Amino acid sequence: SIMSYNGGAVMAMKGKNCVAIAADRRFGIQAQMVTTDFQKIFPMGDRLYIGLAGLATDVQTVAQRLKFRLNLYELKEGRQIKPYTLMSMVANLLYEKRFGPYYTEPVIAGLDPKTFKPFICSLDLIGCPMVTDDFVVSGTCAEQMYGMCESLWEPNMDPDHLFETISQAMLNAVDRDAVSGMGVIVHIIEKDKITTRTLKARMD
């Protein structure tokens, strides 16, 4: 499809007091990959990331537009952003092109700015927000990551087992997928620190 034009997959998983987000590294046209170092996870403030999957055109475009509006907000108001505010902003920007729509499925992963409350949500290609407590996924492969995360998730998880669960889930679900692969980047963050790991994925 149009979402399956360049591949793409973003996984986010809510832990106990921390949150983990991961995505793939492959970029290319329909059958021909190009490079292994394409960025799909973007830092939006501190302890709070966003992921975009689908057409990479809208990925870079919407990333720049959201960074535009975000820096305008944080300069008009000195505090940093709350995640529901970011979710409403993403919903508004995606809903502006109601009939000219972007082809992406944003996933917002962030903590509370005051407490350590994690936050995960996903949106659709027109701006339908959707908050949960377990995990949200996007991209070309869906049912793979759905089966893995419904197979492996526990409610109260230390960041280590959170890391290993999201690692095994991304590895197996991407290795079953065809058009999306070529390495996985993993961001595991918490209130205290930000950790970014890359996995030795099957290069096939």
Partner: protein, 220 residues
Amino acid sequence: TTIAGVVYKDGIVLGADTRATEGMVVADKNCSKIHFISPNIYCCGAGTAADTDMTTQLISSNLELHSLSTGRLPRVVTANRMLKQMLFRYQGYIGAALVLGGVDVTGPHLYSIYPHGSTDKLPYVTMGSGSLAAMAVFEDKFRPDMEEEEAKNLVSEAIAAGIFNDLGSGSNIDLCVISKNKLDFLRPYTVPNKKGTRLGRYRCEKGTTAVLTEKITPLE
């Protein structure tokens, strides 16, 4: 997705099922389709979720504006007129299957809205994909001017028949009670479908995965 409405002897009991499907996959198990409008009026939606949400938030802002300009309780027919005029302005492009309910000075008033803009004043409606099961339960077991628990049991049993039909929800069926003085709102009403516990489990270990490049960044 199956929303339905009814009018009992005083007010309105609304129900819904909260499976937000995307295509062929259950994408959510808890999505509030019972939306805020006013202290007396709510609305329920079906079809395209984001369009219903943006529309109901726009109309809620407009009615907050108009009521605070007025200084008294809003009327349901004003919301009806705003919704039908907007959805007819968009010429049937925007898919919004809406059920509108509130209690005015005049009393309880229930409306159905079809996304072209055709509106109906009815004592009971069903909208959504599996709406036919709830319309079966209503047209079986409706009588005028019921009591509170009768109407609540009826609407719950209607959405329960919808969930035993296709495209229901895993959720604990959402209800809402609007009376002339008392507004109520109930998310975890009744769970028929308990999650079967894994006798597994699918375990792992802290170091069963190869790591290529780790990084540390402190914070405040």
